[PDB]
Amino acid sequence: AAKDVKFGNDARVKMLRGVNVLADAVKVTLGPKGRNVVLDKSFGAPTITKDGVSVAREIELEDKFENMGAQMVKEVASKANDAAGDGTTTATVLAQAIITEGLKAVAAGMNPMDLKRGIDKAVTAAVEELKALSVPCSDSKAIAQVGTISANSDETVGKLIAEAMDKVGKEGVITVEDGTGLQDELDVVEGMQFDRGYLSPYFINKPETGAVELESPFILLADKKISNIREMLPVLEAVAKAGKPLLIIAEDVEGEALATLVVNTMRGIVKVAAVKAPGFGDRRKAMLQDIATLTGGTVISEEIGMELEKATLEDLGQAKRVVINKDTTTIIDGVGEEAAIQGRVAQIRQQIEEATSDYDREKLQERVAKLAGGVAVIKVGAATEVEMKEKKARVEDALHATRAAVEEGVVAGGGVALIRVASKLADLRGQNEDQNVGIKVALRAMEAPLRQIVLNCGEEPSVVANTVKGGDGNYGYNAATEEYGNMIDMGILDPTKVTRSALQYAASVAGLMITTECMVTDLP
Amino acid sequence: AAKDVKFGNDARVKMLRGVNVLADAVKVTLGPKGRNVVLDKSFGAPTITKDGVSVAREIELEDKFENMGAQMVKEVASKANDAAGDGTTTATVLAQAIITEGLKAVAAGMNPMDLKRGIDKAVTAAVEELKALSVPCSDSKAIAQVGTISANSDETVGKLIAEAMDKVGKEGVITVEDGTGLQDELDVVEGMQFDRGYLSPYFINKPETGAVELESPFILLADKKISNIREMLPVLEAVAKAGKPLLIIAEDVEGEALATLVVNTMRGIVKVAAVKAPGFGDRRKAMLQDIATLTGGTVISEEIGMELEKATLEDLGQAKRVVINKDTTTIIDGVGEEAAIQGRVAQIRQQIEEATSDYDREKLQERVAKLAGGVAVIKVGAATEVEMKEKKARVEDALHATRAAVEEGVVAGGGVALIRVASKLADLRGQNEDQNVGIKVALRAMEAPLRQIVLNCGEEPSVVANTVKGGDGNYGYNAATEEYGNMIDMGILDPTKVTRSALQYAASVAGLMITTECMVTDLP
Amino acid sequence: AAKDVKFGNDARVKMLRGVNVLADAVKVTLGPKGRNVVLDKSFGAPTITKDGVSVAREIELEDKFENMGAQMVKEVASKANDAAGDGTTTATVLAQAIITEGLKAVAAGMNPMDLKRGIDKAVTAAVEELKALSVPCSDSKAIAQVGTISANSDETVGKLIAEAMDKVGKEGVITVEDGTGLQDELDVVEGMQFDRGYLSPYFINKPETGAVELESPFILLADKKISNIREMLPVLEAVAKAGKPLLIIAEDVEGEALATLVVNTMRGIVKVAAVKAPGFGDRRKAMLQDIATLTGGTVISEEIGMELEKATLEDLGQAKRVVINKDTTTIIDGVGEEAAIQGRVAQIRQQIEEATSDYDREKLQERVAKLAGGVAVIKVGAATEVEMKEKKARVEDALHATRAAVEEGVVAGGGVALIRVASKLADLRGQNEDQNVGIKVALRAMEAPLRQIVLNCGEEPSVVANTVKGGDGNYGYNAATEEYGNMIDMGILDPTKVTRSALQYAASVAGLMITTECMVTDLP
């Protein structure tokens, strides 16, 4: 409707207060002793979470100027989650520290643009320092420790995650689903498998649940559905002559083909079962080539140079056996050459490094894992539905944290790494005095994540910080055991990527935020 | 609806206040030390920008009379942006200065219409003076300096821009896109390239990512899509006889043609890949003639005296090789005569000098750059999305500023050129005394852009101006280094076109603005 | 629904105040020193104008009784604009003067109807006096002076207008459009030209921009579109036999005819280009005969006794050459007899004196100018859109003023003519005393336009008027030079038609308005 305009200090104060509301809610969930935050949903049962990004999204303020401040700080928490999926609560804390000190500096009469220059320069230097401190994470023990720390110090989570990564490999795919029982369960899938059931329920080779096992079967792939387009008899009889079972993958199969097929399988003429292709025209067609090559078969290009009849038994691929159920199809092992398997994988490398990243790489990797690696699913056990999402959420954070730790390495936890690097940068200077103050402000803000953890434990945050600063290297305070020692030796690890990202995202938004002279928003 | 009307001073005061609100928000973003303004969007996250035109657009006032004043001053900032895309904040300042002094003169009991004439006459003389001061900008260093100054004194921006203009040439096309990394990147395209990928993924000549390389290929252009429109075999056969690869450009190619084509390419009969034309029929058809002429080929006029089959292999154009991927088609070098290349370019000159200007010239120039010059794309690197728009926006201003500086020349920055010209015009007189005062008022307003920069630096605006006036030529104060010297030697440059345009747009609206006796608006 | 009613003095007072509000806004824009009025639009940006009629339209009052008075006075300004397009502000002033004095007489206890008769009788006598004072405006200098005076003393406007009328002639057509630059530009069209481009882009005779020049072409006119309607070969070949270019005018031409036509032209068999007729069926059909007769050709009546094939080469019209572009078609000179040209013009005289007048005459004259005279278009230069409408609006008023001055002559400006005629009518008497007072009141009101001009100049209106009355003939006060002299010799002219119309429209509504005894309106 009609706008409201605020200038200078009045606008900054409202912005800050809004930021404080967002940050105060987020801070309580930081650390081993962190406390849960409950979000109200009209959708159904209210949510209880310790995840800072989840809390940031739900916070909106009635005061438009305060709300604007909160909305801008919201992004840093959201970006951290996007970059690594962990460290979001810590990133918000840094934004709080930087903003509060920065605004205070602005009040002092210092130029905001220069203060931003100081902060950014300090950030660039701090990032390089983090890289030097970062050490490779490769062994199972280190991987388990990062998972355990991410999941609010839950040993079972780290243990299970480490086993998963070990078993599936570097390019394996790991996901998490709600478990049927209280106990946490790990499921590992071997071979080539997809989520498609069988069109003909009637043909079950032996096990119940609709499990079809074909021994030494031939595999058929096609680009069209079959109704009265039954004609394929010379292909079918060729298989009948062989006396071997047939597996069919295509857009669809209709009852006319299925009806004759069922009698043929029961009578003993041929043992044949069929299943639908993966899903969408481009989606299913793309995944057909790998199935055929893996089994040594040839895909029938209805669209291109091939016809339904036009195909020889030799075209069909070979596999040891397959498993089929109402919702899933599995192939134990297609027989094909490694050079062909690797060649399929080699062409995937361009696919792997793609501009799109999100929703590109994720599906793409899954094909890759199926082609030569393995797929792992983790089940989460909880007595109640609300307990279940909290438990599962933390597990995902640990899952993402391990992925980040492996690729970029790890640094000491408890916020020790940021405070330790700050001492190193104590001699860093900018173009002018305002920049020097901005640099100093950023270093000052680095300390805050460490002290929030201590604050949440009900202990003097400044006191612990002074003792930690006094020490050297990886020395720090363990909130869980309320004592000082080597953070790395205690199993407390922070992946380098999340630590780096938290600092950079917090600083980027904070630098711009502190420079705001005037704000424009709608009237109440 | 019911109307509210104000007469004389009451209407002017309300108008002035509206103007002041709009201008005050705009002023803080002027200079090396300028401060950012944050605009609230319901659309998504809030926007932070130093661009005055962006800020002017978003300002609306609750008071209808004040709002009307702001809306009228909004146009000067917007028109300046349309003219050259830079100096919008500076133009707003001049409007502020002129209006405030002009209204004061009106209060004094002076006829407003005469004051407007005085201002306009002074402006006309000032413009001529600017032209005399303006010197040609031809070297890379000068171009870089204007880009660097435009982009809030960022040396890298000016450097990257200058390299681009040098590489592409005078008629080359330069654009800016968001970069994947944190580093600014420059991309240069050589030869003829377009944004359409290949219909047949199946034929890849060698490199991965769908890259197709045809060696000494023949190029075919058509005005019709092909389904069962397979016929053209004798043209195809002729190419097969030749033993050379074929490139196809048309509205579309269907699977039937693609199907036979894929097998033919695989068996080695012919190596042929097809790519879709540019897009819109008036669009792609227009761009077809140049492709053909460049490669020495003939476009097939399905519409006119030509037929699908009717065409000899000789009709087809030739090129060294082409590069094709999923979303892009490139031709290394078609072999055609310069007279044909230039002739296509010569006919473009009418196209260049077009009344529409906006949109018509932009697409048109892009064809031109591809035909004989080069095309450059600049990527912008930033830690966050909000940082990215700010960073990218400034780069565009510098890009536009360089374009303006090359064509109309440059003048000394820091507002020195307007203040320096004002001293020259101190002896300018109008028809009567009221006009003389109007002239004097305009000269007085010229000083303001200089002093706003100083004001934003926390220094006495009048003090710096007095010393600057005392000097001669290009002598002035450098806000960034807080010292006095030759503005041109330092590297602070203002394109003549933006300087001229800012002054003229500000004055045009302001003269009308100060002559308002009565205002009419809807009730609150 | 329910209404509020008022009687006598209470109703008249409310009416008067409404009138005063409307008139006060209008008065400030009267004279060389007149001040601008700004109107708020929800359409887009606000409008700034000195045109009284524009201001009157936008004024509406919250008080229903006051609003009713304003609505009635609005019409006089609007009717004056319709009659001549100028003097609307002056007419409103007369209504103000007459109404205020008339109401005062009603207050005195005199019959209003008699006052009306007195006013009307004085008006009738005043009109006759104006006719006697009116002298013919025939020279370029007098025309320029009226244009310049109308355009708020802008010499360039009068100069450009006079040149336009001189060049085009008495029956020529002059229009005004927004210019492409900051300078006023005049465009004159010689010969026969229309706003239709070519259907076949392919045939361009020589100059770039789609320009087609046919040398000694034959012109063909038709009543239907051509698709498969290609047949007309013997007509076409007859031209081919001749070896001359062909110009085609019809409802439409389709690609079948155009495709063959392009190839025939390309090899030099025939040089033929085709364009579309003027517009709507009746519109294009009406203007076809003149084109044919002008070029000596015959129109093909598909509708009547003629057929597509049925037409000889001799039936085709002949012209020296034609010019064609994408949006326009021009013929240098068709060869036809003057008696036929004049005969076409002679039949137009019935068309010229038409009851419809508005729209009918405007389009009709344009045909007339094209047939034997010329067409002129004036472009208006400005830096901003708002500046552009004000500048253009005044130019149109001057254009209308010159048109009015030529046909009915001119009288001395500055309001001298009305005040001078009033002295003459000082001895005029009615049937009774109340009528005598009404007459005297009207004469009294005549003085007001003169004094508003002086009032707007900040000088004693009564003092100037007393000296003006004291003088003889064309003696008067020049507001622009602040001195007394002969108004005609100083170049200040008022077209007789606007002066007469202003007085008559003002008085007609005012006479009825002063006689109102009771008003009825809706409740607040």
Ligand SMILES: Nc1ncnc2c1ncn2[C@@H]1O[C@H](COP(=O)(O)OP(=O)(O)O)[C@@H](O)[C@H]1O
């Ligand atoms: N038991 C612990 N002792 C010391 N530090 C811990 C302990 N548990 C977690 N931390 C640290 O505190 C940080 C915040 O924990 P977390 O809730 O996971 O926040 P994120 O959600 O990671 O901001 C960790 O990244 C880690 O370095």
Ligand SMILES: Nc1ncnc2c1ncn2[C@@H]1O[C@H](COP(=O)(O)OP(=O)(O)O)[C@@H](O)[C@H]1O
């Ligand atoms: N460091 C500087 N010292 C002196 N003058 C400067 C400096 N930097 C920029 N300027 C000048 O002040 C003007 C305003 O800067 P800018 O923010 O780009 O505003 P526009 O957006 O150009 O109004 C410039 O066009 C230039 O002439």
Ligand SMILES: Nc1ncnc2c1ncn2[C@@H]1O[C@H](COP(=O)(O)OP(=O)(O)O)[C@@H](O)[C@H]1O
């Ligand atoms: N410079 C001048 N000196 C004296 N009288 C003038 C001058 N300019 C215009 N006038 C007169 O005052 C009248 C009003 O001017 P104008 O603004 O054009 O009103 P209209 O809009 O014509 O009522 C004119 O018609 C003319 O007679």
Ligand SMILES: [Mg+2]
């Ligand atoms: Mg965590």
Ligand SMILES: [Mg+2]
């Ligand atoms: Mg700029």
Ligand SMILES: [Mg+2]
């Ligand atoms: Mg006028």
